[PDB]
Amino acid sequence: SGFRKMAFPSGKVEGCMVQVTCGTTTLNGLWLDDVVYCPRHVICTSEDMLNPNYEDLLIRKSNHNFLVQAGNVQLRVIGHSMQNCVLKLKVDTANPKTPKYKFVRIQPGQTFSVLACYNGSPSGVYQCAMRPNFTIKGSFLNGSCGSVGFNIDYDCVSFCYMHHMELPTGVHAGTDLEGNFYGPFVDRQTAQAAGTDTTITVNVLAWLYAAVINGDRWFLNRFTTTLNDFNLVAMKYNYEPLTQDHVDILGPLSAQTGIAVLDMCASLKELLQNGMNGRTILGSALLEDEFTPFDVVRQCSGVT
Amino acid sequence: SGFRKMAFPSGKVEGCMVQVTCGTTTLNGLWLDDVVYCPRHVICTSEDMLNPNYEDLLIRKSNHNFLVQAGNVQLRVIGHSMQNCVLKLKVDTANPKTPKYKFVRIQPGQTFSVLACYNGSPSGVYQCAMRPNFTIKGSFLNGSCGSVGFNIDYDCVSFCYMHHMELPTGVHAGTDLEGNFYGPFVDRQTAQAAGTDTTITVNVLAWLYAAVINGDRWFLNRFTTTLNDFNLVAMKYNYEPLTQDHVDILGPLSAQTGIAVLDMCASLKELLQNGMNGRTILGSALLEDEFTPFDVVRQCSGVT
Ligand SMILES: O=C(Cc1cccc(Cl)c1)Nc1cccc2[nH]ncc12
Numbered sequence: 001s002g003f004r005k006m007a008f009p010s011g012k013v014e015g016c017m018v019q020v021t022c023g024t025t026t027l028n029g030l031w032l033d034d035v036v037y038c039p040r041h042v043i044c045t046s047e048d049m050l051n052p053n054y055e056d057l058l059i060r061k062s063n064h065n066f067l068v069q070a071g072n073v074q075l076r077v078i079g080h081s082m083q084n085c086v087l088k089l090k091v092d093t094a095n096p097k098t099p100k101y102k103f104v105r106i107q108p109g110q111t112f113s114v115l116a117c118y119n120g121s122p123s124g125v126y127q128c129a130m131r132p133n134f135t136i137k138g139s140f141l142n143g144s145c146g147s148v149g150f151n152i153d154y155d156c157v158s159f160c161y162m163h164h165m166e167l168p169t170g171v172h173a174g175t176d177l178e179g180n181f182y183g184p185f186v187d188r189q190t191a192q193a194a195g196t197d198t199t200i201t202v203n204v205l206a207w208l209y210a211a212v213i214n215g216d217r218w219f220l221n222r223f224t225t226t227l228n229d230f231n232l233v234a235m236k237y238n239y240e241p242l243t244q245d246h247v248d249i250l251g252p253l254s255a256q257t258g259i260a261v262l263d264m265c266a267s268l269k270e271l272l273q274n275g276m277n278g279r280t281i282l283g284s285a286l287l288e289d290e291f292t293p294f295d296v297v298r299q300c301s302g303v304t
Numbered sequence: 305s306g307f308r309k310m311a312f313p314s315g316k317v318e319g320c321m322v323q324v325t326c327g328t329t330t331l332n333g334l335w336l337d338d339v340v341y342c343p344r345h346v347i348c349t350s351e352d353m354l355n356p357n358y359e360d361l362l363i364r365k366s367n368h369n370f371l372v373q374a375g376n377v378q379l380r381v382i383g384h385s386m387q388n389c390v391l392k393l394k395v396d397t398a399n400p401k402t403p404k405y406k407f408v409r410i411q412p413g414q415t416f417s418v419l420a421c422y423n424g425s426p427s428g429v430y431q432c433a434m435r436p437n438f439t440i441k442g443s444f445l446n447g448s449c450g451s452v453g454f455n456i457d458y459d460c461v462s463f464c465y466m467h468h469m470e471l472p473t474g475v476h477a478g479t480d481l482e483g484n485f486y487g488p489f490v491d492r493q494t495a496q497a498a499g500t501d502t503t504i505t506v507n508v509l510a511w512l513y514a515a516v517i518n519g520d521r522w523f524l525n526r527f528t529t530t531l532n533d534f535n536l537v538a539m540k541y542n543y544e545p546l547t548q549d550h551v552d553i554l555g556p557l558s559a560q561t562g563i564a565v566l567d568m569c570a571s572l573k574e575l576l577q578n579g580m581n582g583r584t585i586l587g588s589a590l591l592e593d594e595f596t597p598f599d600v601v602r603q604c605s606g607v608t
Pocket residue numbers: 041049140141142143144145164165166167186187188189190305
């Protein structure tokens with residue numbers, strides 16, 4: 001028992017990290033097979049970042065201008081192309097450490113692990129959620145661009161995020177591995193509105209089920225609610241409206257604990273209306289929304 | 305910017321994990337050079353666990369009774385010995401993935417990463433603290449015994465913990481890599497008192513400095529305090545007494561922010577006496593003590 005904000009083991013991703021330098025800029029790249037993926041802003045100088053003309057900046061670059069280093073060994077670049085906001089550097093050697101992998105575009109409210117890197121070297125790993133507004137609240141310093149987010153299903157790494165930018169608000173924005181930003185963001189040094197965010201209701205409910213499984217039960221009450229009534233409360237408290245699709249994904253946790261989803265909704269309703277009263281749930285004094293129902297089941301069943 | 309409960313990249317440790325089976329019991333082992341380390345209770349049956357006679361149980365075992373499997377390949381066991389609460393299984397092949405490593409006994413209040421494993425396969429990685437009472441609040445299910453805790457300083461893995469037991473209270477106990485338990489625990493299925501725990505004051509202060517560095521400043525006040533006055537408050541709130549040694553380790557963070565350690569102590573004093581008033585610090589609604597001053601500097605400087 002016990003419940004932690006657990007990340008996937010990062011080894012399979014550590015073996016893919018490289019350093020990419022173009023001119024004066026260094027960031028991280030992801031080496032899979034014979035391609036290195038990295039943020040296209042590796043080609044910018046500070047003078048360029050207010051609104052870079054990426055097409056023109058890339059025309060001034062040749063294969064030999066992209067310095068790619070995998071630990072201590074240099075990779076030979078034999079092609080380059082820009083796809084949306086990523087560059088794809090074709091190299092003459094397939095990464096021997098390439099794991100089985102997929103590129104996936106995750107949905108808002110889903111979670112993933114981030115391997116924060118600097119100069120192609122891994123620094124640390126943490127778990128986070130893609131907010132409903134498509135930002136991430138990460139831990140990224142200058143030089144972390146090109147670090148990736150991923151999930152692992154047995155031996156397959158599904159890469160879902162590449163880090164590109166820290167907005168002036170201190171929240172993070174990035175792309176899928178085809179270089180499409182999550183959210184409305186653009187790769188320019190400008191203030192950019194991130195939408196209104198909401199709390200991921202189905203994840204808070206999953207975490208309340210994790211709490212019951214792991215011994216924290218004080219918040220269970222004698223009440224029930226309906227989706228309509230619960231959604232009036234979710235509206236007031238800026239929580240995502242709950243749907244039958246969310247109730248269905250909570251089915252396994254409802255079956256494991258014997259607590260009907262709408263009864264757990266009534267516990268969440270009381271917690272939203274009354275607060276925690278100075279108590280904690282799974283070591284937290286707030287309602288946690290960074291665990292999906294799949295994460296809770298995986299953590300409570302010991303999936304490897 | 306941003307601050308997360310970050311674990312070390314686990315790849316170097318993933319390469320050391322093996323499955324050890326003895327009779328009907330399977331758990332995890334750590335393969336370094338030509339030795340596999342695992343909890344000695346791998347030799348017990350359920351009938352043995354109330355108070356096992358480990359010496360007698362191990363006398364009934366031969367090298368060929370210890371089944372060690374590294375992924376899909378079987379290791380040949382050419383020796384066995386019990387050291388405190390660990391078994392050391394000498395194998396005929398040095399682990400090719402053995403990283404540079406050390407065995408260290410950590411101090412209470414220090415932090416480390418855990419690579420939770422089942423059947424020798426990594427499941428996930430998380431960061432935690434060794435409580436002042438020598439327990440850990442982990443995420444461990446049955447089959448996780450033998451999972452290890454570690455820190456990494458550049459290319460060297462310092463292994464500090466091997467998981468052995470979940471106490472009836474749901475908290476975790478284990479040993480250093482020489483098999484000495486942290487705390488008063490014994491490897492038997494009995495209720496065992498864990499001491500009175502306290503909050504790790506120097507880590508809460510480090511985390512308040514991380515909060516100021518990362519933009520959360522609302523808790524800064526016009527006050528100062530002394531070590532004596534602060535320690536009266538720490539006493540009331542079950543916090544570890546602060547010493548000049550703790551003030552000295554907070555020196556770098558004090559220099560980075562320009563906030564004297566005793567002024568930060570006055571902010572912590574007000575937070576202990578008044579609570580958070582429904583506000584958060586670094587996404588937490590409680591005072592976090594699982595980040596050391598070294599962790600805060602490492603995370604805020606991008607060490608790889
Ligand atoms: O965000 C950027 C580069 C950049 C600026 C504008 C647009 C783009 Cl696409 C890229 N550098 C950072 C500086 C400081 C902390 C940081 N955390 N994560 C990144 C990061």
